[PDB]
Each structure stands twice: as C-alpha cells, then as structure tokens.
Amino acid sequence: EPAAAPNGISLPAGYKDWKMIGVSSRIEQNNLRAILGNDIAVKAAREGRTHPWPDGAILVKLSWKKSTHELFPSAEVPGDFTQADFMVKDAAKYASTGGWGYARWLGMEQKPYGANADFAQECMGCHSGAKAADYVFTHPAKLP
Amino acid sequence: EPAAAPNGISLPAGYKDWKMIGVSSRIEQNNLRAILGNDIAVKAAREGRTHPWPDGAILVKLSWKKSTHELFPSAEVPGDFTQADFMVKDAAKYASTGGWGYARWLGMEQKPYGANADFAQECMGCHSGAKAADYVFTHPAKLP
Ligand SMILES: [Fe+3]
Ligand SMILES: [Fe+3]
C-alpha cells in the first residue's frame, strides 16, 4: 500500500473505479484533470446535496500533463500522470479544515505530499475561496 | 427514451456510470471531453488489449463546451453538454466500418445524429487515420 498522508488519511482504495463527476483543464498548470467521486459523492453531486456535501463523500482529482495527440495535433490528451488529490468529507473529524480531509499523492510512485500534518492549510488557502460552496470548486458536469 | 441511431445502434443504458478511460480537450472545438468505457472496454484499456479491441467494448466520449470557472479563471470547466459519441466493437456486425459501430447523440435532448444509415462513413473519414490503433485515437490515461 502507499504511505498515508501526513494527516493520517490513507489512500482510498479503488478510486480508479469510481464514477465521473467532471473534467477540467488548468491553463496555468498545463494539466488535464478528471474528477471522480465515490458513490456517496456521486449521489450527492447528481442530486445537488452539496451544501454541505455529506459525510463520507470522497472527491478525487487526477491530473496529467497535457500533450498533443500524435495523429491529431489539435487534441490535447493526457501524458504523464502527475498527482491524485482527494477531499474526504467528515464534518466532525476534519472540522478544523472546513469539514474536509485533504490529501495528495504524487506520481505513479504515489509519494504522499506535504512536509508535515499541517500541509492541508495550503489546500485551504485556495479552497477557502469556495467557502460558500463548501470548499469545492467543481460543478458536476451536466449530463442527460 | 432516445431514438436509435440511423444504423440501428441503441443508446447504451447507464453509460454515465461507466469507468473512465481518459480525458481530452479539442482546441478547434473549444470543448472538454471525458472518455468512458463499459467494463469490457475498461478491462481492455487497462490490460493494453487494443490490437484489436475485443468484441463487446464500448467507448463513449462525452463533450461539453469549455467555460471558465467563475472563482478561478485559469480553470476551464464544462459548460453545456454538446454530444455523446459511441464506438461499439463488433468485428463481424460492423465489418464495413472497421469493426466498430459508430453512433452520436446530440445535446441534452439526445437527438440521434446522421442523415441516414451511412452517416458513419463520416466518422470513418477521420478514424481511418488511426487504423494502426484499431480506429481508436484515445490512448488510455495512465494511472497507478
Ligand atoms: Fe484544489
Ligand atoms: Fe471521433
């Protein structure tokens, strides 16, 4: 198993099998991202129960470097896998970080991010800008 | 329930719950895409059984117009849903179109695309360029 994050969160097993919530592309990072969630998160996302998200919801964002497809240069496609970011909802347990447990694992080798157990204050530094939306930027993508 | 495509392919039920294969962004369409697959496709993708893909594999590409996140302008995120494109592998049934059944549904209204039953020749026009990769451009995104 990969090492736990410095705040004690273990890597959610099976996240690559989870359902999609959305996708994104971060210009400044030259990354394509997929956002998945466990079934608690997906149910909440689809039913709009995101104020707050429920206890047990886990979101995962998977980031790859952007490359261009060798056969179709206008298609930006994933190259190198760069990291997996997680938010785990537990209003009581992570009340000090807004009710979410943050954790990041880097690369194929899955090195836990962060110098110490307060690393999540970095995450909060930006995610506080989405405080009105329970610290979550992502808007579930529309589907029929 | 949505009408079948002009070549007789019915919309696959439950595609929104399928596992992810990849993501992409098409620069000339200003979209973001998620590529999902049924469990045959996902197993094939993950094992590298793509030369050729096995019969029964279904790939779906979901497309949204790109929007910029209101709280974070360098984040391109899905706006309106534009289309669902499908490729259904059946080397015998779809031998005339490279072993793949193509189909597209447009919009939230899931209107079948295509003027007639030969609409898939359009798809083949470009997809023939990926013939070395069994007519599939997408490279499964690498995950640990
Ligand atoms: Fe973040
Ligand atoms: Fe295509």
Author numbering:
A (entry chain B), B (entry chain A): 18 to 77, 78A, 79 to 161
Provide excerpts from the study.
Cytochromes P460 oxidise hydroxylamine within the nitrogen cycle and contain as their active site an unusual catalytic c-type haem where the porphyrin is crosslinked to the protein via a lysine residue in addition to the canonical cross links from cysteine residues.
Since there are now four carbons bonded to C2A, they must all do so through single bonds to satisfy its valence. The RT fresh structure is very similar to the damage-free SFX structure (RMSD 0.14 Å across 286 residues).
